[PDB]
Amino acid sequence: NQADFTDNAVNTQIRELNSELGFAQLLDNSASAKSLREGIFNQFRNPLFDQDIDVDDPSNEWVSN
Amino acid sequence: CQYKIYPPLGIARVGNGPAIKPLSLSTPEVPWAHLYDTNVQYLVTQQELEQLLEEAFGGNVINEISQIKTKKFKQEEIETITGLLGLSHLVPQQQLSRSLDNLDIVQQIKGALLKVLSDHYLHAVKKQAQNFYIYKCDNPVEKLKLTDGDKVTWRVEVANKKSFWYDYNNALDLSLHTQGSGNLSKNVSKHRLAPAMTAKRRNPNVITNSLRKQLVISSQGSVSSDNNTQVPLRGKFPAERHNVLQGSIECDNEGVLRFYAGNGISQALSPSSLNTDFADNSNWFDDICDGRVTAVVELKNGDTFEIQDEQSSAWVATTPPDYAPQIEPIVTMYDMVSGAALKEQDLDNLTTQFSDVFPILYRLYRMQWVNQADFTDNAVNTQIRELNSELGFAQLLDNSASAKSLREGIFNQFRNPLFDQDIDVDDPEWVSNSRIIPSKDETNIAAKPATSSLKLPFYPNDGIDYPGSPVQWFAIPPFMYQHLQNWAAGDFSVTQVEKESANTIEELGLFYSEQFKNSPNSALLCARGALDALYGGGFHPGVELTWPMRHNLIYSQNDYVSSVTPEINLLGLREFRLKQDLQGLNSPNMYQDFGHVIAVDNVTASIDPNSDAAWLWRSTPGDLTKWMGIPWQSDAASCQAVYTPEDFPIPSWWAANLPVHVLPLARYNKFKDSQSADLPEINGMTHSIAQGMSEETFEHLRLEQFSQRLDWLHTADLGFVGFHAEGGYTNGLIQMVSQWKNMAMVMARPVENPGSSGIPNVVYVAYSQADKD
Amino acid sequence: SCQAVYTPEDFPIPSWWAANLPVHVLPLARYNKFKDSQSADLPEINGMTHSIAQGMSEETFEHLRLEQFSQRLDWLHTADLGFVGFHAEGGYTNGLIQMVSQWKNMAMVMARPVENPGSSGIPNVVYVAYSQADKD
Amino acid sequence: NLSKNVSKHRLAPAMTAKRRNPNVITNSLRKQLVISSQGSVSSDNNTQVPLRGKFPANERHNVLQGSIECDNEGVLRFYAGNGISQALSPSSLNTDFADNSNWFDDICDGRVTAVVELKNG
Amino acid sequence: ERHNVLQGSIECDNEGVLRFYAGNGISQALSPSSLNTDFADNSNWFDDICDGRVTAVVELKNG
Ligand SMILES: [Mg+2]
């Protein structure tokens, strides 16, 4: 899939980590790595499907933005 | 309760004829008034375009003529050629512009201006306009008479919500739990004979309700007794942006409102957007509308009466053209109003006159002029003709035991709206064992042979989508079937005067027509007339309105009031008003919906008048027509034959208003004349050949011509014309957007001496440009 | 593709090779609605019940015979060529496609007798198209 | 696997679905629209066995739904079909992504059971 | 009925140089339902493509 080759920022960061032999940072559960893990996690879609939506007319309708 | 508007639901029809009284039509205000009128002109004639032009040329423009002449033309003497006669509202200024700098003072004045008018309106489909009346009440006594100093100002606000609403897959009420009405048996929902389908949004790429407001076309206007100027109802789509003429209102000095519908123009936002679906085509808008009709009564003495509530206000809905105004649907929208207030299991309390069942047989009989199955494949219509041949139609009116066998013979051919006949119960679903209407998605496995005859009438119905369901085929609704059942068993009354005009179906039909014509209740007759021309099933979606109209929940008041005449019921007269949102366009529910899909669950939840769904029945402008197909031409072109493997009879959808098989003008010119006519051309023949033949063979050729029925889809170029033309279903839908205005119009015409030919004295002839000779 | 070529004018309808690939035929269904005289000895006469057939005036019975005789069916509709079913497309191309299998189910035109035409104007020998779709 | 917000806020409402091949009516005639086959293999004989059905079921087409074989160690090996899908008329085209009348394919799924017999009985 | 076709624009500067612009690229059918499904030959269609004759007249001070 082309999007995961050249349009996926997470895959590009993984390759960035690989190129410096630094993938093990993702296995770090300490606070010095939290912003690294969070930046990746924040790019994933929430299966609650309640993010990036404008609640249309509160009969509520959730409209993605 | 001092003043009320009539009719409660006015009906206007689109057309490209102009919105002027002489060149328009009027919605029936008296049922059956002109069924045999052989002078009707539903298309703009060359005669009326001349008569218009010469009334314009009344003095002293004919002394203006002479001032200009002794004074080609120049910019400002033309500036006042036009305007003199007042053709600004008819033709663009700059089409009459060069009408005459392209050039008995007056005759090539008239000649060029009339060919202008001819180019625009000759043979045009006349608009059928609806008149609205104020009736003083207490109970509508007489129409409001306006003294000097008084004035009435009407107010109409309309909307189109087709592009904003949901797809039409089938009628949602088909699965709605019910006790049963006079319109729909409870067996449909209780036994799941034609389950309602979910329906997605039309134009679904428009997201958020605030952006979907752009999909609704809306307009409003007011006219008063103090000026008969015509004011257009014009909105925008979306709300490039195109102008949509949804209507034109005008009030005369007596306070009557006349409502003209649009010019019948449907259009896409991009030319490449084609209307290939019968109902649901995104990117499209049409000029169909519907909305709220209210008025103020302001008398000389300061007294002001506001007609604003739902009990006294009215509604208007515009529809596709009635292509055979004199042919009535076997079941009308008025029948739907009448059956809406009845409970199914209380139908044994219904009392039946013969005039309650006569319209069924009458309308089914007159369907022969618009549908082949009803001309040569309807054993009930052939028996009517048999009784007509021996002047023995009065036997049908006999409630005795000696005529029970004959009445039962006709009744047993009809379809039972219980939909519990001609079925084999599977794994105890109801599987019909008569003829089915297959899906176009084929399966090369042999059909189960039918074991029961196809009951009448031979039309499709709300459950068309389901092969083997008895609701594939149309049945007269429960309360009308109850009438027929009581007539079968003898439980019916009829007055002696009716038996004295019942030698043929036509004589009795003319009698009942006079009963309508001389009944005094002018308001309720006009109320029934607005709806007696509309269809009332099947609803897929239908022609004009659809399934919400067959539920009592949509009316605020719906009660029986009186018979047509004190002795003759003729299905009766009712006082009905639709439920209305009194805020109209400014309603908070104007733009309501149900999310990504609509389903019967939404309908179920809307029965409770306190739920968040009850708005579905409190109509706002646009709510009546929003269910119908967009553009309407796609449904019209889809409203024809539905062919079975077996060739006959040919199923037809709504042939009374959108005919399927017609008698073209070409055929009429080959049977209208008698052999002793001494024109050079007699029935397409030369004089010598016409009179040189046997008169037996001469009248045999008359009946051959009379029998040649043309496919109504072939009355204009709907994509089948030309070498290697594809034709087909879809090309018909696409071409109908432009060709609706060239489709054949059926009109009553006379055959002055049929002799022994078998041709009736009044025939109904389809007029188009292709069908002429 | 060997049928009608429609012009903007409705009539006459032009036809390619109609004598070997007919375009408008008299189907058996109509034949069974005019072949009998009113005195026939059959419980069903010309599609009608005995009593209704013999109850009508002689003029009207004969008029119905000629009316039936005059109903001509598009020969392309004598079998399923893609126009059968709810929302079926039909059209020229589906005709071509379906004819590969449906050629053998098309109506075959055959001379048939009308034993007592009377004053109907129906000739004593008619030519009637037989197929599975067009028989009743 | 699925948040309750999808149904609760109607983020993607389920649609109604009609029958495939809707012109075949009655349950007993619709049984022919089902292809089925069975077979048995044992560790005593390696010979492969075809699961061959027919469409329409009891012109008819043979459908090889699969093949089974079992080596002497008692391991069953299940092969799927050859990937042959077909309509009953060659003009029936599969133009919808999922629902095409008059078509059948050789995909299948079914019940696998076994019986173990030991020396002592 | 009948459409206006801008086939181009011409202007001449005070130095005698002519500048020729082409149309806007409007292509249209006489009815919207006629589609240009063929790569070259589509009846009922027009476009604003043009070609023609360019001539000039030089008038000097000396007549
Ligand atoms: Mg009509």
E strands, B481-613, where?
Answer: 492-493, 555-562, 573-578, 597-598
Question: Which tokens in the block code for residue B361?
Answer: 């047989």
Q: Are A and C touching by the rule of 3+ CB pairs within 8 Å?
A: no
Question: Which tokens in the block code for residue B66?
Answer: 């002479």
Each as own residue / partner, the long-range contacts of residues B211-214 (CB below 8 Å, 24 or more positions apart, any chain) are B212/B164, B212/B591, B212/B593, B213/B164, B213/B239, B213/B591, B214/B238, B214/B239
Are the CB atoms for B481 and B416 separated by under 8 Å? yes
The secondary structure of B616-655 as a DSSP string is GTSB-TTTTGGGS-BSHHHHHHTSSB-B-SS-SSPPBSST
Chain C residues inside the 8 Å CB shell of B390: 55-57
Tell me how far apart the alpha carbons of residues C94 and C111 are, in angstroms, rounded to a whole number. Answer: 30
Tell me how far apart the alpha carbons of residues B53 and B120 are, in angstroms, rounded to a whole number. Answer: 14
User: Chain C residue with minimal CA distance to D91?
Assistant: C97
Tell me how far apart the alpha carbons of residues B466 and B446 are, in angstroms, rounded to a whole number. Answer: 17
Are the CB atoms for B62 and B109 separated by under 8 Å? no
Q: How was this structure determined?
A: X-ray
B599 marked as part of a ligand binding site: no
Question: Which tokens in the block code for residue A18?
Answer: 């690989």
A32 touches chain D (CB under 8 A): no
Number of B–E residue contacts, CB under 8 Å: 12
Q: Are E and C touching by the rule of 3+ CB pairs within 8 Å?
A: no
Backbone torsion region of residue B44, taken as left when φ is above 0, otherwise alpha when ψ lies between -120 and 50, otherwise beta? beta
Tell me how far apart the alpha carbons of residues B432 and B419 are, in angstroms, rounded to a whole number. Answer: 9
Burial of residue E55 (CB within 10 Å: 0-12, 13-18, 19+) is exposed
Are the CB atoms for B141 and B28 separated by under 8 Å? no
Which residue of D13, D15, D23 is in closest CB contact with B467?
D23
Tell me how far apart the alpha carbons of residues B671 and B684 are, in angstroms, rounded to a whole number. Answer: 8
Give the residue among B4, B625, B628, B620 at the shortest CA–CA distance from B292.
B620
Distances (CA, A) of B437 to B135, B168, B424: 48, 20, 17
Tell me how far apart the alpha carbons of residues B499 and A37 are, in angstroms, rounded to a whole number. Answer: 94
Chain D residues inside the 8 Å CB shell of A63: none
* H or E stretch at B700: helix B695-707
Give the residue among B34, B129, B33, B141 at the shortest CA–CA distance from B523.
B141
With tokens 């109902």, the residue in question is: B279
Tell me how far apart the alpha carbons of residues B603 and B136 are, in angstroms, rounded to a whole number. Answer: 37
Tell me how far apart the alpha carbons of residues C11 and B669 are, in angstroms, rounded to a whole number. Answer: 13
| Residues in chain A, overall count | 65
D5 touches chain A (CB under 8 A): yes
B277 marked as part of a ligand binding site: no
Q: Do D89 and C101 touch (CB under 8 A)?
A: yes
Are the CB atoms for E44 and E30 separated by under 8 Å? yes
User: Chain B residue with minimal CA distance to C57?
Assistant: B389
Tell me how far apart the alpha carbons of residues C76 and C24 are, in angstroms, rounded to a whole number. Answer: 9
Alpha carbon B245 to its chain centroid, in Å, reads 20
Q: Give chains near C: 3+ CB pairs under 8 A.
A: B, D
In 3-state terms chain E splits into helix, strand, coil percentages (rounded to 5) of 0, 25, 75
Tell me how far apart the alpha carbons of residues C55 and B726 are, in angstroms, rounded to a whole number. Answer: 48
Tell me how far apart the alpha carbons of residues B237 and B215 are, in angstroms, rounded to a whole number. Answer: 7
Give the residue among B607, B595, A57 at the shortest CA–CA distance from D7.
B595
A20 touches chain B (CB under 8 A): no
Tell me how far apart the alpha carbons of residues B366 and B376 are, in angstroms, rounded to a whole number. Answer: 12
Question: Which tokens in the block code for residue B418?
Answer: 């219980």
Question: Which tokens in the block code for residue B584?
Answer: 């109209």
Are the CB atoms for B100 and B113 separated by under 8 Å? yes
Q: Do D16 and B195 touch (CB under 8 A)?
A: yes
Q: Do D23 and B465 touch (CB under 8 A)?
A: no
The SS3 call for residue B696 is: helix
B295 marked as part of a ligand binding site: no
Tell me how far apart the alpha carbons of residues B376 and B649 are, in angstroms, rounded to a whole number. Answer: 9
The SS3 call for residue B118 is: helix
Please report the resolution in angstroms.
2.2
Chain D residues inside the 8 Å CB shell of C101: 89, 91
Task: Tell me, in angstroms, the distance from the centre of ligand 1 to residue B511's CA.
Answer: 21
Q: Do E29 and B268 touch (CB under 8 A)?
A: no
Residues in CB range of D120: below 8 A, 6 or more apart: none
Q: Do D88 and B444 touch (CB under 8 A)?
A: yes
Are the CB atoms for B380 and B672 separated by under 8 Å? no
Residues in CB range of B219: below 8 A, 6 or more apart: B157, B158, B159, B232, B233, B234, B235, B244, B246, B247, B289
Number of B–D residue contacts, CB under 8 Å: 74
Q: Parallel, antiparallel, or unpaired: how do β-strands B762-767 and B745-750 relate? A: antiparallel
Tell me how far apart the alpha carbons of residues B408 and B484 are, in angstroms, rounded to a whole number. Answer: 9
B274 touches chain E (CB under 8 A): yes
Tell me how far apart the alpha carbons of residues B430 and D26 are, in angstroms, rounded to a whole number. Answer: 9
Return the number of other C-beta atoms located less than 10 Å from residue B617's C-beta: 20
Q: Are A and E touching by the rule of 3+ CB pairs within 8 Å?
A: no
Q: Do B208 and A63 touch (CB under 8 A)?
A: yes
DSSP-derived secondary structure letter, B455: P
Task: Tell me, in angstroms, the distance from the centre of ligand 1 to residue B412's CA.
Answer: 26
Tell me how far apart the alpha carbons of residues E63 and E54 are, in angstroms, rounded to a whole number. Answer: 23
Give the residue among B230, B225, B220, B287 at the shortest CA–CA distance from B89.
B230
Are the CB atoms for B414 and B478 separated by under 8 Å? no
Q: Do D5 and A48 touch (CB under 8 A)?
A: yes
Q: Do B272 and E33 touch (CB under 8 A)?
A: no
Print burial letters for B334-352: b (CB count within 10 Å at least 16), e (below 16). bbbbbbbbbbbeebeebeb
Task: Tell me, in angstroms, the distance from the centre of ligand 1 to residue D119's CA.
Answer: 87
Return the number of other C-beta atoms located less than 10 Å from residue A10's C-beta: 13
Question: Which tokens in the block code for residue C114?
Answer: 């009308």
Identity of the amino acid at B24: S
φ, ψ for residue D37, nearest 5 deg: -165, 160
Q: Do A48 and D3 touch (CB under 8 A)?
A: yes
Give the residue among B700, B690, B691 at the shortest CA–CA distance from B754.
B700
Identity of the amino acid at B109: I
φ, ψ for residue C57, nearest 5 deg: -60, 150
Tell me how far apart the alpha carbons of residues B251 and B152 are, in angstroms, rounded to a whole number. Answer: 9
